[PDB]
Amino acid sequence: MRAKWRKKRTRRLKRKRRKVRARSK
Amino acid sequence: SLPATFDLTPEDAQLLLAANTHLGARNVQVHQEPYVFNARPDGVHVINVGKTWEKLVLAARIIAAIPNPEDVVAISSRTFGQRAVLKFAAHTGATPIAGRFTPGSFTNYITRSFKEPRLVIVTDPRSDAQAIKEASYVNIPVIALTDLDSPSEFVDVAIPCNNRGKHSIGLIWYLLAREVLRLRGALVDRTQPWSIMPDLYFYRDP
Amino acid sequence: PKKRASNGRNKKGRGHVKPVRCVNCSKSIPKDKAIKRMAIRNIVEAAAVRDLSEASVYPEYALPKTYNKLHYCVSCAIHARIVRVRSREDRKNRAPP
Amino acid sequence: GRVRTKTVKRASKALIERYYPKLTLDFQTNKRLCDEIATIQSKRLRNKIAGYTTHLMKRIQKGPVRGISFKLQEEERERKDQYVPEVSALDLSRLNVDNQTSDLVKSLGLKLPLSVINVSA
Amino acid sequence: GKGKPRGLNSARKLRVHRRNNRWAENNYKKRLLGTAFKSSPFGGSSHAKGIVLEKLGIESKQPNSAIRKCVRVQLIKNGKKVTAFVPNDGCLNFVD
Amino acid sequence: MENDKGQLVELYVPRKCSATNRIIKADDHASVQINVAKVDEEGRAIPGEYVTYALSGYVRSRGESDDSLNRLAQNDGLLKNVWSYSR
Amino acid sequence: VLVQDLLHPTAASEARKHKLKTLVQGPRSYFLDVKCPGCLNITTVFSHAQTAVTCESCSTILCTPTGGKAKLSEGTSFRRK
Amino acid sequence: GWVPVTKLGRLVKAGKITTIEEIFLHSLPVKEFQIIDTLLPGLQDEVMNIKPVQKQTRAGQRTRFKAVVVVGDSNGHVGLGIKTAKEVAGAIRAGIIIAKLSVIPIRRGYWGTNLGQPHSLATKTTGKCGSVTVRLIPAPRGSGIVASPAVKKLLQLAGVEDVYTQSNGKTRTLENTLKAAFVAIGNTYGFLTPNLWAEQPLPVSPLDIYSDEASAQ
Amino acid sequence: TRSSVLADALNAINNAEKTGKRQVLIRPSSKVIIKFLQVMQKHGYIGEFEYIDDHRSGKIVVQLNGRLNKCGVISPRFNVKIGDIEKWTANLLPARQFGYVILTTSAGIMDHEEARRKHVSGKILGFVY
RNA sequence: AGGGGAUCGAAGAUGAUCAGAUACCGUCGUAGUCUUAACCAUAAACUAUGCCGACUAGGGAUCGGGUGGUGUUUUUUUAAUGACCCACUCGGCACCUUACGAGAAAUCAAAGUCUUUGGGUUCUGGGGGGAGUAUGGUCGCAAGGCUGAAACUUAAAGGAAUUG
Numbered sequence A: 001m002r003a004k005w006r007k008k009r010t011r012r013l014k015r016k017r018r019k020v021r022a023r024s025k
Numbered sequence B: 001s002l003p004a005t006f007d008l009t010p011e012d013a014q015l016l017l018a019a020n021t022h023l024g025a026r027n028v029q030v031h032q033e034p035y036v037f038n039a040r041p042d043g044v045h046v047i048n049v050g051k052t053w054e055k056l057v058l059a060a061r062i063i064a065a066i067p068n069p070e071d072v073v074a075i076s077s078r079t080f081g082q083r084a085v086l087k088f089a090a091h092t093g094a095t096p097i098a099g100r101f102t103p104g105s106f107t108n109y110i111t112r113s114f115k116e117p118r119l120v121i122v123t124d125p126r127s128d129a130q131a132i133k134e135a136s137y138v139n140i141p142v143i144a145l146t147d148l149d150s151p152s153e154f155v156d157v158a159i160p161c162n163n164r165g166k167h168s169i170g171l172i173w174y175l176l177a178r179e180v181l182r183l184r185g186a187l188v189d190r191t192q193p194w195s196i197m198p199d200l201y202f203y204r205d206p
Numbered sequence C: 001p002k003k004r005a006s007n008g009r010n011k012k013g014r015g016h017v018k019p020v021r022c023v024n025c026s027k028s029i030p031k032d033k034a035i036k037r038m039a040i041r042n043i044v045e046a047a048a049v050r051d052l053s054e055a056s057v058y059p060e061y062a063l064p065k066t067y068n069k070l071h072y073c074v075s076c077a078i079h080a081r082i083v084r085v086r087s088r089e090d091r092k093n094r095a096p097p
Numbered sequence D: 001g002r003v004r005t006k007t008v009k010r011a012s013k014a015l016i017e018r019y020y021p022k023l024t025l026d027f028q029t030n031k032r033l034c035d036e037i038a039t040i041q042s043k044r045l046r047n048k049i050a051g052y053t054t055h056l057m058k059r060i061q062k063g064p065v066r067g068i069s070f071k072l073q074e075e076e077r078e079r080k081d082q083y084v085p086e087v088s089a090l091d092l093s094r095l096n097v098d099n100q101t102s103d104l105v106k107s108l109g110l111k112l113p114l115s116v117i118n119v120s121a
Numbered sequence E: 001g002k003g004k005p006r007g008l009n010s011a012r013k014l015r016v017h018r019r020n021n022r023w024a025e026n027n028y029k030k031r032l033l034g035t036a037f038k039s040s041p042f043g044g045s046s047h048a049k050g051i052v053l054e055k056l057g058i059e060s061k062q063p064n065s066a067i068r069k070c071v072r073v074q075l076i077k078n079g080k081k082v083t084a085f086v087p088n089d090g091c092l093n094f095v096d
Numbered sequence F: 001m002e003n004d005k006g007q008l009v010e011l012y013v014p015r016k017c018s019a020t021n022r023i024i025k026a027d028d029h030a031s032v033q034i035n036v037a038k039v040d041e042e043g044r045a046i047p048g049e050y051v052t053y054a055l056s057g058y059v060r061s062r063g064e065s066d067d068s069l070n071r072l073a074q075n076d077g078l079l080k081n082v083w084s085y086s087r
Numbered sequence G: 001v002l003v004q005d006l007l008h009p010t011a012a013s014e015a016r017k018h019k020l021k022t023l024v025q026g027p028r029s030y031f032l033d034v035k036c037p038g039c040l041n042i043t044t045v046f047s048h049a050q051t052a053v054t055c056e057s058c059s060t061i062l063c064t065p066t067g068g069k070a071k072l073s074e075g076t077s078f079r080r081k
Numbered sequence H: 001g002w003v004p005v006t007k008l009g010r011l012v013k014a015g016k017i018t019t020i021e022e023i024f025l026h027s028l029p030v031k032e033f034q035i036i037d038t039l040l041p042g043l044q045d046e047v048m049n050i051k052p053v054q055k056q057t058r059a060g061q062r063t064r065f066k067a068v069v070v071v072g073d074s075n076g077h078v079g080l081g082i083k084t085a086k087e088v089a090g091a092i093r094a095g096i097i098i099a100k101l102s103v104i105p106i107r108r109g110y111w112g113t114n115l116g117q118p119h120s121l122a123t124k125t126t127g128k129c130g131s132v133t134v135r136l137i138p139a140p141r142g143s144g145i146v147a148s149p150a151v152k153k154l155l156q157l158a159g160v161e162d163v164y165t166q167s168n169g170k171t172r173t174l175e176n177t178l179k180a181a182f183v184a185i186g187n188t189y190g191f192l193t194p195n196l197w198a199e200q201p202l203p204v205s206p207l208d209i210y211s212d213e214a215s216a217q
Numbered sequence I: 001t002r003s004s005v006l007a008d009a010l011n012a013i014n015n016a017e018k019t020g021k022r023q024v025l026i027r028p029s030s031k032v033i034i035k036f037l038q039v040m041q042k043h044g045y046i047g048e049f050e051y052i053d054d055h056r057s058g059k060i061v062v063q064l065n066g067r068l069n070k071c072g073v074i075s076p077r078f079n080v081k082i083g084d085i086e087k088w089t090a091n092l093l094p095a096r097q098f099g100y101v102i103l104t105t106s107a108g109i110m111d112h113e114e115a116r117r118k119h120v121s122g123k124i125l126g127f128v129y
Numbered sequence J: 001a002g003g004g005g006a007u008c009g010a011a012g013a014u015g016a017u018c019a020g021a022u023a024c025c026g027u028c029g030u031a032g033u034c035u036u037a038a039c040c041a042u043a044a045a046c047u048a049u050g051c052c053g054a055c056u057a058g059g060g061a062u063c064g065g066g067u068g069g070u071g072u073u074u075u076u077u078u079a080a081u082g083a084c085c086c087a088c089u090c091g092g093c094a095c096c097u098u099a100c101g102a103g104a105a106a107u108c109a110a111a112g113u114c115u116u117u118g119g120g121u122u123c124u125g126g127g128g129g130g131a132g133u134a135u136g137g138u139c140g141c142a143a144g145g146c147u148g149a150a151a152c153u154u155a156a157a158g159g160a161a162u163u164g
């Protein structure tokens, strides 16, 4: 797992975690 | 300390000027500046020949102080000095080494060319660098025929002279032999010139 | 570890130089790091000169030459054997021939 | 296919070293003399050693061979080495000296037959 | 001056720098956070008591191959569940 | 050095470099000792009578031995006008 | 060289050195009396002037400022000090 | 028996040189362990480590064994020897020879007052090899060798009674640690102290005095 | 910028001594430097030294006898009581018998032994051995 | 958000290749590439080398400024000036040799003047993961940035070099 792609994947999980939280809010 | 009849006699200066021993390199390195009596137009640096004569006489006193003449060793890998070192060998004790130095001559006590000298005279600190390097391993003082550009690493006595001319190299080795013999029971009287001339020390083609 | 003191390029005092395009593959290359060669060719050949001297007006007119500076990326220069990978001591040698 | 091993080359080298006067340019007598001056366990090895000795003698007839030193060539080595010219090359042929060298000798305070010359810039 | 300040009047800087950087140590961090009292099965104590909930056979990590015979225990003072190894040949029979 | 009541206790007192006054260690194999024969009237060697200098391996490895030896030999009268203090 | 007289260096060495880097630093500049084409009035000119120095008779120019020493105005004579 | 091949061994065999301190004083290179055997008969050795080193090959790993050897009389001399060989016994024998050939003096001194014989070092010394730095500090009488067992044994073979040791770096690298200690004790006669400031007449080497029976023809 | 003229001076002497020079130039020659050099001179660690008078701060040429192992500064100039001089000597000096820790006291700049027998204390300037 | 939008060209289309190819290759192609007015504040933003000061070795080249040669060169024949040559000097981008010294080494004139440990000063690190994650705060239109844990897990991870 390349480091910048793991960073990109983690930005995708973070970007959707901050959407489910806003939804559940 | 010297009486001195050991001053540069005008006939010896005559030989040194005729051998071009005063014509030095165009790039003096910083440990060889004391031996410079000004540059020439067109770049050649003049060596102070009187300082060459004093250093040579000091070198011969160091050679004469060695108890066994056969453990005085003289090195010349350059052809311009090979005959000169051989003639120095024939006239003094002077175990000669002309040509390849065979790494391990001063170390490696099992080599056939293994010597354990008390003093080493080299024609060229650049070309005979292996012998100088090996001398620094086993506590051997070094005299060297140095030009103004030749390195002075592990060289204790430097004779400032032209390193390029075969007449210069042959003359310095011949003068060193003559002065060494003069400083012992071999050239009993110092005034009269030596019977043999500086030419038989010069390299010859082919 | 570090392979070269001049990292792979010729840039000590810039930060940014400019890109150039590889003549073989169009790769973008800092101009100082690009492998540069000067192809000076006869406009015809090393063998058709006699033919063109026989079959042309203006006896031995000019024999014009073609000049072009080629820029190579590291990969294309190695694969085309322009720079020929070297030993540790021999890569420190900057002489052309 | 005919490269000689060091055992042949060294044996022939030593033979020339200590038996050059006894040797010749003829293989037949060279092998007949290898029988008496050396102990070789094989006739074929003796033939090779005498053949390479004859080869090196043929080479020795035209200039010295490097690494091989015998009395008959060393004696003429010092005979040629003791050559001494009739007149010096460091004696005066008529002493050309320039300005800085003249200042050198006069700083030394030696009176010599100098001759100051000018060099083009 | 190899980094750190050396003035005779730089005591505040040096003591604060040391305070800041002691948080990089495991033991200092744990003690000052009180993690043993807060986040630990034993509340910072050397021993604890519990009730055996069930016997477990734990498969040991490679390259070993064994069943390690632990028990699930519920601690009396916390209610937390822990797994405890039962050390010896047998001795799981003694635990029940 | 020497204990309470005298008795020099030194395995040995090492030589010191005649140029830098550094101790010449037992393993300093690049250090040299140079003997210059003293000369009587009409230029004779007088064997066994030398003006002696010691040079550290450091000075020789720095290319300074020739200059240092010029200064010491001139200070001892062996040389006349080779070395100069000012430069 | 490892032994040298730092208190008494050669005048050639000192003249070679930078002005700030001699044993005691000092100026390599000087002052000149300059005689103009017109009159024989003495005016003192700094070597590295920076001023287009003029006189009373030839009230235009004696020296032209440069990046270093000023250049005299091609019709004057001068003496140091 | 032993027939010398060097001038120094020739003189030591002839008895013209009777102490190894002359060899130290004149910095004479030693190239024959018979010189050390003759001049220091009471020299005891100890093997301090035998660890294998391997060289990867087309077919498996070639193994040799490297022996570290320390020699020394407890009265001011030690030598260090490192040798790798096919057999442990061979590496040990050649390590003993190298250790004897490297024998150096050490300068023992007083921690405080000069009562009695020297019992410690005369100066703080350090040595470095690889990452390992070994620092030796003079210690008061009765302190003993405050050092790890390997350095302690080397100092015991040296003759130091009281010393403090401080170490930095990967001291578990034993050969580096012993080399660092060997350097630090060797530096004891390098360090110039005010009681060594006095000028000395600069003696003449026996290589010159007995040049007659040296360099045999 | 220059923060300790004495640190610069003692560095210059150290780097000259380590390379084998018989002399060294020092700029700009405070009087604390002068007193420090005089304490080294009275114990034989240097030779004769010269103050060159330029009209700004002077320079010093120091002659070196080859007997200095190390001269150093202790910055900051720590306050030293009578009873913690010996811990400075233990930390800094190679042996108890030789070597000097230089202090500055209201009784003057001096070595630690003169400080011991005058029973005075102050700040630490440096060390020499 | 305007303008511009030749070119190349995340997306997309399409032709191939291949087991597959939603990749490399081919042809197009929106955004973008450019500009104006605002945002953002991040890069292997690297010399992976904080800044200021001092000292320790030799060399030649080079850029900018200066100083000095009864030094060349063109312009009237040479004045000058320019350009060039030589010798110095300050400042700068670098380079070469050597290893004093340093380093684990690679290597390094600083990465030297360090257990013989202190010139001034700022920032940062403390085994590998979890994790630059979660949480709170703050900035931002957004993308995101700055600040930033723990529970838990683990005997290694890693650096440089050697032989294969």
Ligand SMILES: [Mg+2]
Pocket: C001
């Ligand atoms: Mg790589």
Ligand SMILES: [Mg+2]
Pocket: C015, C016
């Ligand atoms: Mg950049």
Ligand SMILES: [Mg+2]
Pocket: E003, E004, E005, J122
């Ligand atoms: Mg700080």
Ligand SMILES: [Mg+2]
Pocket: none
């Ligand atoms: Mg960043």
Ligand SMILES: [Mg+2]
Pocket: none
């Ligand atoms: Mg960074």
Ligand SMILES: [Mg+2]
Pocket: J092, J093
């Ligand atoms: Mg620049």
Ligand SMILES: [Mg+2]
Pocket: E024, E025, J126
């Ligand atoms: Mg930690």
Ligand SMILES: [Mg+2]
Pocket: none
């Ligand atoms: Mg960590």
